[PDB]
Amino acid sequence: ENLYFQGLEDLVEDSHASLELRNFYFNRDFRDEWAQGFLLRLESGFSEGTVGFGVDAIGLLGFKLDSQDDYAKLGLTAKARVSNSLLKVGALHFKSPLVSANDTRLLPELFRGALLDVQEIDGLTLRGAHLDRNKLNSSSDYQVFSANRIGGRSDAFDFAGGDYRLTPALTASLHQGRLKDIYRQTFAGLVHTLDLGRSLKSDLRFARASEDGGFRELDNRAFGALFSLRLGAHAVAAGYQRISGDDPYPYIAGSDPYLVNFIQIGDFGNVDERSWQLRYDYDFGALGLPGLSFMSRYVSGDNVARGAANDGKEWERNTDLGYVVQSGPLKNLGVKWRNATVRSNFANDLDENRLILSYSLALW
């Protein structure tokens, strides 16, 4: 009676829910898809007690329009909290150096598994996960994993990692993971944030991977550095990335790699690839146009392995223009245009346009 009945009420009492509408148009021109999506998110409260329990749900629905994102899926996530720690089991969507779920299409990628987040020690976040399925952004069904470019088949991704604030400005990270029967990978990172009150973020990354289990021998290293300068409404970033070893940068296929020069289309993670990035952002708020945004970036890669040579080269430009309605009936309605051009001597030259209309409504 009592505590159990009350627990079920408390799950609802402290719950919240939202509905997102997305209209997505995509075109690729080599030197076409329109779809509508709905995303219903429910997050329960927790039952009272030292250990609190809850449940989240995500409802996804997509269909193609005339002018594979044609599915419906409901995913549940059981959760438990104690002190400042949280366990989620079921449908997962999160970002971390060794595994990050994608959401740059119509409907999000989901993983099936368990994710633990422990924040009991001052300045220290410890995370770990066991994942056993990948639901690609464009499909309804959970499937087993493979690695980007490298292939393979795996039914387990495991990682643990810590992000530690050594000082208020400096955070050190170490994450270690395994895509079972394909690869092992470890990531170290150091991120320094200098606020001049005007700011400079310095983001250094290094990851090494080797084979796991009976998989063929694998050797990859990836160094990245990204320096992000904010100057009022302006932002400028400069990035450098170096891939080395016999193999390209491994990550779960369908998901996002934690590479500083991973942009709209390319990851710049090819064998031996050296690349640099320049990025500019302007926030129109100060000018008096608060919903408006502009970003443009350019990444140039060389040294890419082409057989026994290293004369592979590619570049990619991206430009994002966006507006979010600030007031009136259509407040929160957003439109984003993402335009990309890729030119390469080892892959397909491509131009891509995305147009995304989005609207989110808080239900309660």
Numbering used by the authors: -8 to 22, 31 to 66, 86 to 215, 218 to 384
Copy text from the publication.
In such microorganisms, the majority of small molecules are taken up by members of the OprD outer membrane protein family. Here we show that OprD channels require a carboxyl group in the substrate for efficient transport, and based on this we have renamed the family Occ, for outer membrane carboxylate channels. As expected from pairwise sequence identities that range from 35%–50%, the Occ proteins share a similar architecture, with a slightly off-center constriction formed by the inward-folded extracellular loops L3 and L7 and residues in the barrel wall. The transport data demonstrate that Occ channels have a pronounced preference for substrates with a carboxyl group, due to the universal presence of a basic ladder on one side of the barrel wall.
To determine if the phylogenetic subdivision of Occ proteins exists at the structural level, we determined X-ray crystal structures for seven Occ family members (OccD2, OccD3, and OccK2–K6). The pores of the proteins within the OccK subfamily show a considerable variation in size and shape, suggesting differences in substrate preferences within subfamilies as well. The next substrate tested, pyroglutamate, has a similar activity profile compared to benzoate/glucuronate. As with benzoate/glucuronate, the channel that is most efficient in pyroglutamate uptake (OccK3) was indeed predicted to transport this and related five-membered ring compounds. OccK3-mediated transport is affected only with the cephalosporin cefotaxime. OccK3 thus appears to serve as a specific entry channel for this antibiotic, which is borne out by the liposome swelling experiments.
